[PDB]
Every structure is written in structure tokens, then in C-alpha cells.
DNA sequence: GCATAACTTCGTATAGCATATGCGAAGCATATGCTATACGAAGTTATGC
């Protein structure tokens, strides 16, 4: 850590701006490179392309998915670039091995994953079960899913919306605004969000976040400044799934239960089942055209 | 005086997206950098008997 961290902080001085997600990632690549570089002693910072070739073969023998290795190589090249040295990716051999292992592991039959779809009928079932609920933290989850499906928002978008961010019409719909665009909400879940607001009492300042922590004994808490962590919002979907079905299987496979994208895929696939014109889908999601939309539509029943 | 529920901070793995190049000479298929989940685990503190 210390030596590598102090080295990387030279780049922090030289290149101070990144997403919190990027500079998290580069450090965790460098940890693994340094560890390997110790366990077979070679010079640690200035890369030798033959050593990169050894490293890429060592990773390929652990059978990591090709999307991982291409990222490790990317981060190494970023580090050389912003430090001010020739890029290891300039090596012909490095390219040759990358192409070879890419073809090999593709021929080995890997597939990209796709999340389980939160189709409309599951929402209707869980609503039919929880509609009678009065325990506060049930109400919260029932409202949350009601928005997170209908409005097609990304999980880290909906986590942000302040009560200031919401507009209301008496006897009608409710409208939501997100960073110059406005999105509109069905006359059902309006009643759920109204119930949540009126029972929890978060409305004392529009600057409060609409979603907030709730404690063991059923009393809510306000906050103007502390948001609910997305790691708990995934803990909503996974909990309600574990309420409708038994526990996850021990095979360790991923996407065995709903996650943040299960709403988007559920909505898109249901709209395709409704026979919508696909450009209307692309307009609703705002998605720049790439075949991921087709892949979500890949099959119906 | 200790046990518990519901949540917050780290870490090592993959998917999304915006932009750019070829190849061929019009259009877009494939390639490249950067940003964001999914999951298991360790750690926090308020309420309770």
C-alpha cells in the first residue's frame, strides 16, 4: 500500500480529477500487479512487455472472463500514459496474445449474462400480498418498487430525488423532474407515495430526501443531507424475492434473484409483449441505439 | 449489562456507454476509455429486557 499509494498520489497531484469509481479501480489493479511482481521477482513499476505477456497468461490460466483481462490491460496502459512512458499496448506481442486468448475463450462458449425480469405479474402479486400492510418499513418498500418499475429510472437516479423535486396536481397525476426533463406517474402508485409521505412526515422541508432510514421499532427518521445507500436498495429487491421464494441456490451463480436492472428489463420486455414500436421504447428509455435493447427483447415466452 | 435489527464502508469481479476509427469510399461494424452494478463480508449503534 504505502509505497504504491504514495506513487499513485503523484498521479493524484498530476491528474487530480476522476470519478470515485475510477481511482478506486486503478489502485486495486496495482495491488494485484505488485503482488505477482513480488512472488516472482521483477522490476515493479516500468513494465516489460514479456512480463505483461506472462501476467496475461497467468490470468488466462485462472480462466477469468475476457472482459476482466481487457480491463486489467487497460488500466496498466492508463497508468503508463498518465505517468509519461510508452504504452505497453504498443507491443505487437501483447496484442497478439490478447487476440489469441480472446478467440480461445470465445470459442470456449462463454455468454454474457442477463438479469431476471421483474415482469408486471410479479408486481401485481407482491402488491396483492402487501396491500394490507401497516408496518412502516413494508409501506416504504411497496412505494419504492411502485416507482422504480413504473418510472424506468436507474437505481442511483431514484435514490436522489428530493421532495423539492416532485410536482403534484390535485385529483390527477404526479410529475418528477431530473437533471430539464420531466416524467409522469400512473394514478395507482400516486396513492402509495401519498400514503408514505403522509404517514412518515418527511415533508417538513422539501430539501429532505424522500427515502430515508427506518429503525427497528418502526419510527422513521428525516434527513436533509444523508441519502440511503444503494447497497440497501438492492437489499429491498432481494428481500422481497426471498419472501416470495426460497433462499438462493448454493451454486454461486449470479442473477439468481432480482437486482436493480430487473425493473428496466421487466418494463422493456413487457412493453415488447404489448406490441409497442421499438423506437417508442428507445424514446422512453433515452437509450442510444445499440443492440442491448434487442438483446433485452431477445425472446418473448 | 448484553443481544439483536437494519444499515454503512471495502474489496475483487463484470456490464453499460460514448466515441472513435477503418474499410471504402456510404455507412456502419468492430474497437477503445471511462463509469457503474453485483455480491460477500466486516463493522456501527440504537432499542430492548
Amino acid at each position: 500500500s504505502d509505497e504504491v499509494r504514495k506513487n499513485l498520489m503523484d498521479m493524484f497531484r498530476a491528474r487530480q480529477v476522476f470519478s470515485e469509481h475510477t481511482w478506486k479501480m486503478l489502485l486495486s489493479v496495482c495491488r494485484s500487479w505488485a503482488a505477482w511482481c513480488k512472488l516472482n521477482n521483477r522490476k515493479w513499476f516500468p513494465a516489460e512487455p514479456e512480463d505483461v505477456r506472462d501476467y496475461l497468461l497467468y490470468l488466462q490460466a485462472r480462466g477469468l472472463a475476457v472482459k476482466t483481462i481487457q480491463q486489467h490491460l487497460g488500466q496498466l496502459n492508463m497508468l503508463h500514459r498518465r505517468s509519461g512512458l510508452p504504452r505497453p499496448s504498443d507491443s505487437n506481442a501483447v496484442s497478439l496474445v490478447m487476440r489469441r486468448i480472446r478467440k480461445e475463450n470465445v470459442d470456449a462458449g462463454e455468454r454474457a449474462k442477463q438479469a431476471l425480469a421483474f415482469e408486471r405479474t410479479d408486481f401485481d402479486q407482491v402488491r396483492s400480498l402487501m396491500e394490507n400492510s401497516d408496518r412502516c418499513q413494508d409501506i416504504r418498500n411497496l412505494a419504492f418498487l411502485g416507482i422504480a418499475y413504473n418510472t424506468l429510472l436507474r437505481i442511483a437516479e431514484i435514490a436522489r430525488i428530493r421532495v423539492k423535486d416532485i410536482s403534484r396536481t390535485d385529483g390527477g397525476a404526479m410529475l418528477i423532474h431530473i437533471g430539464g426533463v420531466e416524467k409522469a406517474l400512473s394514478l395507482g402508485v400516486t396513492k402509495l407515495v401519498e400514503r408514505w409521505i403522509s404517514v412518515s412526515g418527511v415533508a417538513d422541508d422539501p430539501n429532505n430526501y424522500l427515502f430515508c432510514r427506518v429503525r427497528k421499532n418502526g419510527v422513521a427518521a428525516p434527513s436533509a443531507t444523508s441519502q440511503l445507500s444503494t447497497r440497501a436498495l438492492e437489499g429491498i429487491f432481494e428481500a422481497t424475492h426471498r419472501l416470495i421464494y426460497g433462499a438462493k441456490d448454493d451454486s454461486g451463480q449470479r442473477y439468481l434473484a432480482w437486482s436493480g436492472h430487473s425493473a428496466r428489463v421487466g418494463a422493456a420486455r413487457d412493453m415488447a409483449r404489448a406490441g409497442v414500436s421499438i423506437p417508442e421504447i428507445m424514446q422512453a428509455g433515452g437509450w442510444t441505439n445499440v443492440n442491448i435493447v434487442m438483446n433485452y427483447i431477445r425472446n418473448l415466452d
Side-chain angles (χ1 to χ4, degrees):
Chain A
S1 184
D2 307 25
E3 298 186 330
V4 56
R5 191 177 69 204
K6 189 173 182 179
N7 182 287
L8 292 175
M9 290 297 178
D10 188 18
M11 197 178 76
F12 191 101
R13 290 172 182 179
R15 292 296 184 269
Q16 296 161 27
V17 182
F18 291 117
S19 170
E20 295 181 357
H21 300 117
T22 297
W23 189 86
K24 173 183 175 180
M25 196 70 253
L26 184 153
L27 185 151
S28 185
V29 166
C30 295
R31 287 175 169 174
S32 296
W33 166 264
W36 177 97
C37 193
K38 184 178 181 178
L39 269 59
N40 296 106
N41 176 39
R42 304 187 195 181
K43 68 185 180 185
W44 98 263
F45 163 62
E48 164 164 14
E50 314 313 320
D51 300 354
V52 177
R53 200 181 185 164
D54 292 347
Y55 182 68
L56 293 171
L57 293 169
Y58 161 82
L59 295 186
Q60 194 272 350
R62 294 209 300 128
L64 306 181
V66 65
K67 186 63 172 183
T68 300
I69 292 178
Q70 190 173 24
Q71 178 171 319
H72 283 40
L73 182 58
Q75 292 297 335
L76 291 175
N77 285 283
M78 193 199 301
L79 181 61
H80 288 72
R81 180 192 181 197
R82 283 185 171 95
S83 182
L85 293 177
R87 294 176 182 80
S89 66
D90 196 28
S91 171
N92 64 324
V94 174
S95 180
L96 284 162
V97 296
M98 178 74 267
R99 297 298 288 188
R100 187 179 183 279
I101 69 184
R102 184 176 183 234
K103 291 180 178 183
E104 186 71 8
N105 287 32
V106 167
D107 290 347
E110 299 298 340
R111 295 185 184 176
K113 295 294 194 174
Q114 176 179 114
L116 289 174
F118 190 63
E119 303 186 44
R120 194 183 215 111
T121 55
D122 291 340
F123 182 77
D124 282 347
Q125 182 170 1
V126 300
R127 179 177 172 190
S128 179
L129 188 146
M130 293 200 293
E131 179 78 57
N132 193 247
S133 309
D134 286 341
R135 186 174 179 265
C136 177
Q137 76 108 146
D138 299 348
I139 302 179
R140 192 188 71 189
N141 290 359
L142 181 59
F144 172 82
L145 298 171
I147 305 182
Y149 165 44
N150 191 178
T151 314
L152 206 66
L153 303 177
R154 202 191 302 271
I155 189 170
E157 296 175 319
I158 182 165
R160 292 176 183 159
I161 75 183
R162 283 182 159 91
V163 175
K164 183 178 177 182
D165 303 331
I166 298 188
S167 181
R168 48 175 56 261
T169 183
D170 50 299
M174 191 180 292
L175 304 179
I176 294 179
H177 170 272
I178 189 167
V181 63
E182 296 183 3
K183 295 187 178 183
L185 191 77
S186 65
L187 210 74
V189 301
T190 52
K191 295 189 176 184
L192 301 178
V193 299
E194 281 291 339
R195 192 176 186 215
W196 167 245
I197 291 163
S198 57
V199 174
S200 64
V202 298
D204 285 354
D205 171 0
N207 199 31
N208 285 274
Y209 291 121
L210 177 62
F211 291 95
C212 205
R213 188 170 181 177
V214 178
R215 292 191 180 281
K216 182 177 178 181
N217 67 15
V219 183
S223 189
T225 65
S226 183
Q227 64 176 358
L228 180 62
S229 315
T230 62
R231 186 57 183 86
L233 289 177
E234 296 174 35
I236 300 176
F237 286 100
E238 191 166 32
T240 60
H241 177 270
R242 191 171 172 275
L243 182 151
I244 299 296
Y245 306 104
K248 301 191 302 190
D249 299 338
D250 294 321
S251 67
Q253 285 289 348
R254 314 212 307 167
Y255 307 94
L256 298 181
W258 304 323
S259 71
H261 287 296
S262 292
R264 274 187 160 195
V265 176
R269 202 170 189 181
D270 189 46
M271 287 181 66
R273 172 60 180 171
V276 78
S277 302
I278 192 163
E280 184 158 20
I281 310 179
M282 298 156 62
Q283 175 64 96
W287 307 328
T288 296
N289 183 16
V290 64
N291 296 324
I292 71 190
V293 184
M294 178 288 303
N295 195 46
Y296 294 167
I297 295 165
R298 169 64 196 288
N299 188 28
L300 302 175
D301 297 352

